[PDB]
Amino acid sequence: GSHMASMKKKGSVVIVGRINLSGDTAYAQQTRGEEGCQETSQTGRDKNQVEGEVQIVSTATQTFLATSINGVLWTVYHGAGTRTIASPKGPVTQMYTNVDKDLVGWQAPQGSRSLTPCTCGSSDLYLVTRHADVIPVRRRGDSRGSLLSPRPISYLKGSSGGPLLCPAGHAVGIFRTAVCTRGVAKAVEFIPVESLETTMRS
Ligand SMILES: CC(C)(C)[C@@H]1NC(=O)O[C@@H]2CCC[C@H]2OC/C=C/C(F)(F)c2nc3ccccc3nc2O[C@@H]2C[C@@H](C(=O)N[C@]3(C(=O)NS(=O)(=O)C4(C)CC4)C[C@H]3C(F)F)N(C2)C1=O
Ligand SMILES: [Zn+2]
């Protein structure tokens, strides 16, 4: 538009829940409902206590995941764009933005726990979805893995920004893309942790 005084502002990304990997069972928890999410997106002020490594996040129009690795909460550019994230003191600006990697990052929220970047060189991986499904994935390239059990894409939708982990629970990558045939996801692509570690200068 040409009328700046009425131009709107996009809201912040908001943490609305988490994937609980604390104990012996993985399960999703919601920490904020739709109304509070909308309000928090507009104000950027989120006083809710944050816990864990994998957050469920939402904008006004999308919901996906975000994962803390080495003190950074990482997600996909196609979900977050350039948006701030809501936090107790107001909106927090991205610390990393790389559209070429489909990647953004913010400082990890107080109370979150961070995954350690994997140095195992292991190719037996585990994708964690927004429904707390743990999906075996065989690493097939620097940024590619095949699902041991293919699944309709509906089962993976909304899980971009989630982790692929190694057998020891280290972060190997950030889920960003599915490779499908006739609506069935047979493979995934991810941002490898080394591409993050480069981004971080670790
Ligand atoms: C057909 C398909 C499966 C929808 C699509 N596959 C696909 O295109 O495969 C091609 C062929 C082989 C590799 C790949 O090359 C293109 C790479 C695309 C990309 F990913 F790098 C990407 N870079 C962007 C950068 C800037 C702006 C937009 C961008 N948009 C992109 O891709 C778009 C987004 C991505 C997506 O849906 N991700 C997931 C997800 O859950 N999102 S989400 O949470 O629901 C949500 C949309 C709320 C945020 C994990 C997959 C879940 F559904 F399984 N896409 C399309 C796909 O996966
Ligand atoms: Zn490892």
CATH of the domain at 38: 2.40.10.120
Token pair 């620097």: residue: 142
Give CA–CA dist 121/7, Å, rounded. 49
Closest to 131 (Cα-Cα) out of 13, 12, 17 = 17
For residues 14 and 95, membership in a common domain is answered with: yes
What are the residues whose beta carbons fall under 8 Å from the beta carbon of 144, sequence distance 6 or more? Answer: 179, 187, 188, 189, 190
The range of the structural domain enclosing residue 186 comes to 124-200
Residue 95 lies in a domain: yes
Work out whether the CA dihedral 192, 194, 199, 202 comes out positive or negative.
positive
Give CA–CA dist 82/120, Å, rounded. 32
Q: Are 154 and 65 in contact (CB under 8 A)?
A: no
From 79, 107, 135, the end of a domain falls on: 107
For residues 131 and 178, membership in a common domain is answered with: yes
The technique by which this structure was obtained is: X-ray
Give CA–CA dist 185/123, Å, rounded. 19
Q: Which residues of 143-172 are buried (b: 16+ CB within 10 A; e: fewer)?
A: bbbbbeeebeeebbebbbbbbbbbeeebbb
Resolution (Å units): 1.9
Q: How many domains does the chain have?
A: 2
Question: In this structure, which residue's CA is closest to atom 9 in ligand 1?
Answer: 179
Q: Are 60 and 74 in contact (CB under 8 A)?
A: no
Give CA–CA dist 177/77, Å, rounded. 12
> For ligand 1, which residues put their CB under 6 angstroms from it?
62, 64, 77-79, 99, 102, 153, 156-160, 175-180, 185, 189
For residues 71 and 129, membership in a common domain is answered with: no
Helix (H, G, I), strand (E, B), or coil: what is residue 160? coil
Token pair 């400082």: residue: 107
Q: Are 165 and 175 in contact (CB under 8 A)?
A: no
Residue 117 lies in a domain: no
Helix count (H) and strand count (E) of the chain? 3, 13
- Which residues make up each annotated binding site for Zn(2+)? 118, 120, 166, 170
Q: Are 83 and 40 in contact (CB under 8 A)?
A: no
Residues in the chain: 202
